Design a protein around this ligand. Structure first.
Ligand SMILES: NC(=O)c1ccc[n+]([C@@H]2O[C@H](COP(=O)([O-])OP(=O)(O)OC[C@H]3O[C@@H](n4cnc5c(N)ncnc54)[C@H](OP(=O)(O)O)[C@@H]3O)[C@@H](O)[C@H]2O)c1
Ligand SMILES: Nc1nc(N)c(OCCCOc2ccccc2CCC(=O)O)c(CCCCO)n1
Length: 163
């Protein structure tokens, strides 16, 4: 099973300036809970965005997708395409595609689940922003309640599965 997991503003932004333009501790915890013990597949720019104590993401098999065959990525497995990332020599019952926008677009046709955090934060998109994928009629989902973070933002989790 191949799942995507992301957090987006209601406006659809996932990334800006090499990071994530809000602070949502409940989402970091959600991400860690869902992914721990599993494979996490990411694009090279997302690998480069990980803060020091999270590069590699502890307790998970980190797979980095790049066209730079010689790339050094200590703590991760480097592969040359998304298809390679999803064709491991050692299978995993759960593989999560963890971003970014480029890789989500390639992975969406191959996935059967999306776990989405929606963040009610006013962020008019800017020209270099990374944006969330859009789920069409081949997906259906369920939504948790709107919650308020201890740090102030309204957020909610959605779970989608391929019809
Ligand atoms: N909010 C969230 O849930 C979330 C999650 C993850 C990331 N982010 C944010 O999103 C941003 C990064 O996303 P992004 O869209 O810019 O980049 P990305 O998807 O993480 O990485 C793009 C890179 O992947 C590689 N790649 C893309 N297509 C490929 C292909 N067909 N074959 C091989 N390699 C391929 C290339 O690496 P090379 O250039 O090395 O060849 C490319 O530059 C950051 O701001 C990050 O903080 C947010
Ligand atoms: N729902 C959701 N899906 C995602 N694919 C996602 O990006 C995951 C890649 C970026 O990871 C981080 C970036 C900065 C600080 C910590 C981490 C992960 C730490 C760990 O797990 O050890 C996020 C963002 C979660 C963090 C911000 O709240 N959230």
């Amino acid at each position: 099973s191949v799942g995507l997991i992301w957090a987006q503003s209601t406006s659809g932004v996932i990334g800006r300036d090499g990071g994530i333009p809000w602070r949502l501790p409940e989402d970091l915890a959600h991400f860690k809970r869902l992914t721990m013990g599993h494979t996490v597949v990411m694009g090279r720019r997302t690998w480069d965005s990980l803060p020091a104590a999270h590069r590699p993401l502890p307790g998970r098999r980190n797979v980095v997708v790049t066209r730079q065959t010689g790339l050094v990525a200590h703590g991760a497995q480097v592969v040359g395409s998304l298809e390679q990332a999803l064709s491991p020599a050692e299978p995993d019952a759960a593989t999560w595609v963890i971003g970014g926008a480029q890789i989500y677009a390639l992975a969406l046709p191959l996935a059967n689940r999306c776990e989405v955090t929606e963040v009610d934060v006013d962020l008019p998109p800017e020209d270099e922003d990374a944006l969330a994928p859009v789920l069409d009629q081949t997906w259906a989902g369920t939504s948790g309640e709107w919650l308020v973070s201890r740090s102030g933002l309204r957020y909610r989790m959605h779970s989608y599965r391929r019809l």
